[PDB]
Subunit: 228 residues, 4 copies
């Protein structure tokens, strides 16, 4: 039996401003930084040691990862950063005020974009100044894996290969894994690991700043799930 | 070799091709004919000056051995080699090990054509506790069991081939590496579908002959400039 | 930038530097001054347009945190990061955790100077069963025990730094990658000795300032074209 | 099996052995006899139930091909394979490509004994611009030029073999991997000296037969429990 630990990053500066973020590379707020430190201290007090840490390539998640590791006396743990763990891309909604958006397109269309499993947002123009295609951190990837907008379903389709190639093999080799990522990428992993239906997954809550522990059997089936 | 070039090679005849048995993920060896095809392909790559910086292959022996022979015969057995289940042949389900002629007799030509190549229909599945299930092969011991297939068609094969293109092959090309991919009919057809932007309808007619090096000349964005067989 | 550049950053003051203690492999934290030094360096590199493709650091927290601060303050925390024991500070043996002044009072000024600055004089060795021996730190649990030292001089530090230059740092530069190395006084001094071609007799006089980015312009043979501090 | 086992295999006869030519880093092929020795060793490993999780070899074709044959004849060609210059044969300098009798004529009979029986005496070095210099070989193009030697003795061979033990082989064993190492007389001898703790005075007399699997049973600390030829 192996334990697998997830941590979702806390508040960003754009959450505080009520802005859609997606793949925009925004900084944690002071509150979000404290949440990361509190989470690392909790893992330390319960004696959680890690052999490898997986994160996204977005600064708010990487910094959360580093804070959690440092506050639990294991900043030496190897770290792999991957676009496959990025937040869901929000298309042309990125950078927009959620209130101003609901007032422009209506409360109902906004609810769809945020709460529908397989409804894509309005897509971002491929050569927009704030398109991910212009971001150097994706330069080594074929351009067509850089999305112009995602929902949770498409987010899952690109998270899952990283579970299959890196996370699950690490667990099966005996490694104690930390995953430090985002609301929707962690929600995608949880849907797969726990076998949650399409109908139920959009309602699954993953709190920010609270370590989530899975206990898995030799076939990676969930035996225990609890928040630290 | 003025442009960035990518080379594919499909392995030659296997012992089960000669016996007319469905193979799929069963780990059968090359026939002498298939061994000769690999050597002739390596000599052709040598004669035309094809140097590689990395080689990708499946974890099925017939493809790995093809890869090794091609490298040796072109004087570059030192080239680093990555083996991945994601480049395996399609899984043939319960049909693995059966005679193709007897299967066509029992079920009819058209049903056999659908099992051979479909974008929407799976072969009959192989029971997970069968003695020859891939779940029992230690080369997949570090994969979740739900990743190890019980049967696949071309669409499902593509869906597990593509992440390897996204994570390993395409980054290698974009980094400037001259890539060799030595694999199987269906996994190479899956890559070609994505590389060439072929529709779900049209990929059903894409044929890739055994033992003939296939060269793509790609531009800076990995679009096909030219495609030809050596 | 017009040429291929290699950047070194030595971490700033630690909480043990302020208190005049030998540190070695003890995993001490940066002081407030050391943290500010790392931010100022990242700002400098940001202002001068230094982008990195890969970052190398030790497994000691003060160096990793320096590396992370520098990347964050130059808008590139996404850069891949490899941590290795081979970039650790020189192990100071039994002197680790001792006060340098009280050590000089006990053994004399010259002996502490020899321990600090002799190229090939080992410090007194730390017993392998000591609670603060590196053999008990789980970050070295995946290494054979006989590579975990009980004490080091600069000569043996170079002997274990150099393979990491040969296997990882130099191949990265040669592949075209813009490299950051965030480490310690003795491990960077070791790299400098090799890169610059400094004699055994001259290296103990080489100073590497803390928290100041050091830039090597290199040619295609990794020979120093120019060395300057940012 | 019972404990953690590590298997070495020295490649069999090369085409230069019957000509009595010093080989070193020259990339010579296995003879038909050498090919048979590899197949028989793989057959022996299969019969005795030796499964591998990872295989390490040099970047010289005769060792890589031995490694591939051993894996294939034991039904495990899928095993991941890492090729490294650090497992190359000892570089023989200016003696490479020369007859052992013709060497006695140009240097004298006693001087040849020293070059083949002294732990720490270098052979005459090969000029870096020689037609048959390793510096011209593209398999080392991704490495700093000074790791490619102009000639080596066993001591210098051990100095560049040992980091690969420390970085790759021993961490694999310590993680639970069943390791195969397919390499050369002097690089395997270097490994044996370190693993077994053999002195400088005794190691030059250590014989490693060709084509004969060598098995180490190691304990959790990588201490030898038993060493035996299969």
């Amino acid at each position: 039996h192996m334990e697998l630990v997830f941590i979702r990053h806390g508040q960003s500066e754009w959450n505080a401003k009520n802005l859609f973020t997606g793949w925009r590379d925004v900084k944690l707020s002071e509150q979000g930084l404290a949440e990361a430190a509190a989470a690392g201290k909790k893992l330390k007090e319960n004696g959680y040691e890690f052999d490898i840490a997986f994160t996204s390539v977005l600064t708010r998640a990487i910094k959360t990862c580093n804070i959690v590791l440092e506050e639990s006396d294991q900043l030496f743990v190897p770290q792999i950063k991957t676009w496959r763990l990025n937040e869901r891309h929000y298309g042309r909604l990125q950078g927009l005020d959620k209130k101003q958006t609901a007032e422009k397109y209506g409360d109902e269309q906004v609810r769809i974009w945020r709460r529908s499993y397989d409804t894509l947002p309005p897509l971002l123009d491929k050569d927009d100044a704030f398109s991910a295609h212009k971001d150097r951190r994706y330069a080594h990837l074929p351009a067509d894996v850089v999305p112009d907008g995602e929902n949770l379903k498409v987010t899952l389709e690109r998270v899952l290969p990283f579970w299959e190639d890196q996370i699950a093999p690490a667990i099966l080799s005996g490694k104690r894994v930390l995953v430090a990522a985002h609301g929707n990428s962690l929600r995608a992993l949880a849907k797969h690991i726990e076998g949650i239906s399409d109908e139920d997954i959009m309602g699954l809550e993953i709190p920010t700043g609270q370590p989530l522990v899975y206990k898995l059997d030799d076939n990676l089936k969930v035996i225990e799930k609890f928040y630290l």
